[PDB]
Ligand code: NA
């Protein structure tokens with residue numbers, strides 16, 4: 001069965017199955033995700049998630065990133081750190097479309113701190129469990145062509161991320177293939193959040209809950225709870241989250257091939273929906289024609305701004321107000337880039353989003369939907385056309401952006417993003433120590449060195 | 458106003474004065490039946506697993522695990538474990554459109570009432586109001602699709618509407634503003650929705666346990682200021698994601714409010730199995746009496762063919778169940794156990810009983826037929842059974858309504874006797890009788906601590 005093929009691989013994959021490339025790519029993902037989390041601990045949604053979670057205590061506990069004072073049961077530590085990771089839509093993005101690392105990394109750091117292993121949990125053990133969690137998500141996404149395109153009904157992290165967390169937790173716990181299977185079945189009953197709460201303050205909890213519920217499923221499987229033995233094979237099981245469900249068995253452990261070895265992740269340079277990174281790139285490029293040697297946008301002289309984009313309705317927001325809406329707005333990212341010449345973390349403060357000059361530009365934006373601009377991160381582009389009041393029009397088309405898997409961030413730029421994100425809450429020495437540890441994570445003998453640094457300062 | 462706003466307005470705005478005599482009468486029955494299901498459910502392995510998992514969580518506030526004075530949990534986890542107990546044996550109440558409404562709501566309110574004592578005290582009438590708001594919200598959400606009138610095909614309804622009913626009941630207990638009631642619903646939507654495949658497995662009871670737990674979590678997060686989509690119930694890509702054909706409608710105004718429970722009663726089960734098998738058991742019980750009257754039951758080996766004419770409900774089509782959970786979801790096993798044993802009782806679903814060779818011999822003779830008029834709705838469906846013997850004689854019987862269905866509801870006496878049988882496994886007779894009396898007069902109770910103190914046992 002398909003379900004059995006997943007359980008067999010989760011249990012059976014070994015450190016020796018890792019490739020150099022999958023280790024290199026997952027180390028980049030781990031660093032980027034830690035940075036997103038640390039920056040996320042400054043957000044209101046993180047404060048709410050932590051205030052809720054703090055009602056719970058346990059003799060078996062792990063720590064919230066950067067917050068030595070907040071010790072939580074590992075399920076709730078993973079919840080809060082996951083909320084932080086996804087709080088600003090700054091975390092990594094894959095193809096088919098999901099945010100994979102945020103569902104997996106805080107699970108494994110929580111469990112490593114809360115539950116000593118024998119032998120002790122090593123950097124390679126972490127990389128193995130992490131890559132199993134990533135791999136399971138990607139294989140589940142490939143169960144339907146529709147997961148290649150932007151989601152219409154369920155938010156993918158809540159669907160595949162929940163099972164990825166369960167798989168990573170099952171790997172950490174050393175569960176038998178039978179108990180790995182049960183963990184997946186139990187996780188299915190915790191999976192699946194609708195798309196409506198995207199672009200609201202609740203969206204980050206989709207990743208926090210994926211992390212939390214995956215651990216809960218693994219724990220319950222460990223204790224002996226049973227679920228449907230064919231849960232991934234059934235239209236009324238995991239297929240309930242898909243419009244057209246086409247599942248397939250995994251490859252055999254013999255000469256296993258990782259999806260991450262043939263599909264890199266995208267890393268964001270600013271905290272917003274990935275589709276808007278194409279918009280930002282094109283708007284930055286067209287701006288050169290408008291400002292000449294003056295460095296100033298001729299705002300009053302612009303007649304019309306046309307964005308030729310894929311039809312992605314949850315990112316079509318002509319007048320966003322909240323930070324969450326602006327992160328999901330083709331239009332705001334275009335106009336802020338034209339006006340400001342860049343997009344940064346403060347671009348999504350409410351006081352920037354509602355600037356009168358921004359709203360003047362937003363009043364001039366029209367969307368067009370070219371038929372070949374399909375709503376997939378592997379296909380889509382943005383073409384922007386700016387028409388001036390004298391009738392002159394300048395056009396710029398971006399089919400990728402720096403940080404996309406087609407143009408991946410350098411190690412240097414990835415580390416500089418991490419430094420910017422983490423220095424809000426950690427000291428310089430801790431930031432540099434984390435860079436060095438993660439860069440050489442396969443050499444780390446004891447993960448407690450990593451989890452101790454994550455407490456700060 | 459939006460559909461979502463109309464729900465928040467009603468949750469916040471409904472008052473004890475809006476309750477009718479009939480909704481109080483029917484909900485008092487639901488509360489007693491659900492307590493009994495829970496008490497009996499504390500004997501099950503799934504409850505013990507849920508309890509062992511939950512015991513790792515401590516909090517400064519705590520509530521009781523029913524019948525377990527040795528176990529106190531944060532109210533979220535108490536509602537979780539008691540909800541698992543309620544649904545652990547598929548013995549809890551069933552509504553139209555199809556769901557199990559009380560299990561998602563009662564353990565929420567008993568947990569919160571004990572963990573967060575109020576002044577003025579939380580009265581029986583306050584409990585009845587918050588309970589009936591939770592029930593009402595579920596019913597209105599079920600009516601957002603014609604398909605909820607029929608058996609589910611993709612998502613298990615308790616996980617969908619139960620989660621929001623819990624959120625509503627918790628929001629009512631906590632006295633949240635209408636705005637925060639709205640946010641609680643929106644947050645709850647992101648916690649809702651479990652697929653059907655885990656029905657007939659040991660995980661199904663967690664659908665009700667999680668509905669209870671996640672509704673409280675949503676209300677707590679709303680109380681802390683978390684915000685979600687303001688039109689979550691209006692949107693195809695919000696709550697509509699769980700429905701094939703979504704057709705939401707505003708609630709009526711509170712100034713002229715009518716409760717769904719006033720025009721649609723619940724069904725109470727007589728044995729712990731899927732409601733659709735209660736028609737099968739009823740029909741098989743009668744055909745058995747006919748066979749015995751003609752001296753044609755024994756030997757069981759002279760039965761050649763057993764035809765069940767039933768609705769097309771494939772997750773209850775299980776010709777050779779082996780586990781307890783499969784047998785509770787098997788037309789075939791319920792028919793065969795009734796024919797062999799002459800009744801269906803709690804031990805009928807122990808695996809030793811399920812896997813008796815005589816049972817397997819009867820199961821191998823069963824065939825299902827699907828009459829087109831036997832629609833998969835608890836309002837419509839029936840069971841016809843035909844037993845043919847080796848000598849050719851055919852005995853046919855039929856059940857259009859079984860005792861316990863809303864059309865033929867359990868008398869108060871029989872409902873109380875079911876409670877006694879279920880609750881006496883964990884409670885002393887004095888406590889059992891005290892709970893019957895308290896619930897029967899719940900509108901007169903000044904302080905719900907009198908009720909929650911008894912729930913600890915013995
Ligand atoms: Na979807």
Ligand code: NA
Nearest residue numbers: 239240242243
């Ligand atoms: Na499907």
Ligand code: NA
Nearest residue numbers: 306366367368
């Ligand atoms: Na145009």
Ligand code: NA
Nearest residue numbers: 191192649650
């Ligand atoms: Na769900």
Ligand code: NA
Nearest residue numbers: 697698700701
């Ligand atoms: Na729908």
Ligand code: NA
Nearest residue numbers: 743854855856
């Ligand atoms: Na009859």
